[PDB]
Amino acid sequence: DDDKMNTAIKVIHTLKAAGFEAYIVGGAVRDLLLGKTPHDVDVASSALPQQVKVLFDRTVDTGIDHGTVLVLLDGEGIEVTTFRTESSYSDNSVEFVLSLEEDLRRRDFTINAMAMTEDLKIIDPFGGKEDLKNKVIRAVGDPDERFEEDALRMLRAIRFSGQLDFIIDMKTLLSIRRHARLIRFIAVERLKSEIDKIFVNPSMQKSMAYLKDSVLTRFLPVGGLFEVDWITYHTDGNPTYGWLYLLHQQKRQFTDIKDYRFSNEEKRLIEKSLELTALNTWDQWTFYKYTLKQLEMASRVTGKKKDLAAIKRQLPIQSRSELAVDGWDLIEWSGAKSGPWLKVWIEKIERLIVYGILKNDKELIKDWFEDEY
Numbered sequence: 001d002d003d004k005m006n007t008a009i010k011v012i013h014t015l016k017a018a019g020f021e022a023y024i025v026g027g028a029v030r031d032l033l034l035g036k037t038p039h040d041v042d043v044a045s046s047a048l049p050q051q052v053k054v055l056f057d058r059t060v061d062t063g064i065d066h067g068t069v070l071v072l073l074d075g076e077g078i079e080v081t082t083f084r085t086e087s088s089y090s091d092n093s094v095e096f097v098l099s100l101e102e103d104l105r106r107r108d109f110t111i112n113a114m115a116m117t118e119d120l121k122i123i124d125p126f127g128g129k130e131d132l133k134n135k136v137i138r139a140v141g142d143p144d145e146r147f148e149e150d151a152l153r154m155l156r157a158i159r160f161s162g163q164l165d166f167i168i169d170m171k172t173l174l175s176i177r178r179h180a181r182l183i184r185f186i187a188v189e190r191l192k193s194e195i196d197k198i199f200v201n202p203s204m205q206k207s208m209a210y211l212k213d214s215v216l217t218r219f220l221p222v223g224g225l226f227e228v229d230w231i232t233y234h235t236d237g238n239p240t241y242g243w244l245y246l247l248h249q250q251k252r253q254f255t256d257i258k259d260y261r262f263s264n265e266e267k268r269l270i271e272k273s274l275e276l277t278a279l280n281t282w283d284q285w286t287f288y289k290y291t292l293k294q295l296e297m298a299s300r301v302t303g304k305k306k307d308l309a310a311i312k313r314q315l316p317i318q319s320r321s322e323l324a325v326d327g328w329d330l331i332e333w334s335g336a337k338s339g340p341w342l343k344v345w346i347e348k349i350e351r352l353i354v355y356g357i358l359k360n361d362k363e364l365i366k367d368w369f370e371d372e373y
Contacts, residue, residue, distance in 0.1 A: 007076040008041040020047040023115035143175035151182035162207035180215035199242030221259040
């Protein structure tokens, strides 16, 4: 941000004062050249991780095995990574290298394979500058090698196309088509992360067309389900809405996408939203029992535009904890022993309160109960 680049320049200055090479690398150079403000600024250096820690008071050591040290400075965090190459075996291997160019030549795409010196000189051995100008996502070097090194890069190409409103380089895209089957080796968590980004990024309809055209929908987990008409999809900023929109369009249920390992919270949002889309009429009990995010997501995917927040807000009560009676009141009044019957009767009372028929008052509920029971 307005401080991240400055902090990275300071980190670079410190590494070089100690005799090491250091550069801004990767997405920050791309964003800079695009006239955008970087979200992350990575620094590539000849320093090894323990030498970085010597030079900075506050570091975080999570990625040390991979050559990365997070430097905490001026209220920012700058990742400092030693010149390295990586490769993923088929069953889900880092080499430290001695030069910058050895690191750059194994990165995913030319626009991500540039470096910038402290003095703003761009190091661009693979023509990232021209691909950035032409709006092209092109694998560095031989696309076949880049995709065999990490098959997730094939999907990443799709994500970048939407994120940046770029096209995918023809030779690169043809290489994805030839290697699409390799996506089966990628951990589903990494696939869901990229797909979630696509679902909230611009030009997503173009991204989903590349998903099909690249042959990735042939081989992704339940990949054919992504081949829906996305024209009427508009992100609410929550990737979960993309999965809901995907299921609703095809009249399918959550079990069909469970391979992607949703959290219980995400799964609930999807399942409860889908229920609402199949519910013919919503009334006070609907608005009471479902969450506002569920009502809003169901409304969004079915086209409704009601003021859901106001309807839920104007219910007589918001939740069970406001109820003026509990099961032990019913035990007292009934003279019957505790049992599952209490839940049945508490809900009868709860409904009458939520519909504003019975007052949420213990004595009046007591009168009602003794009559009905």
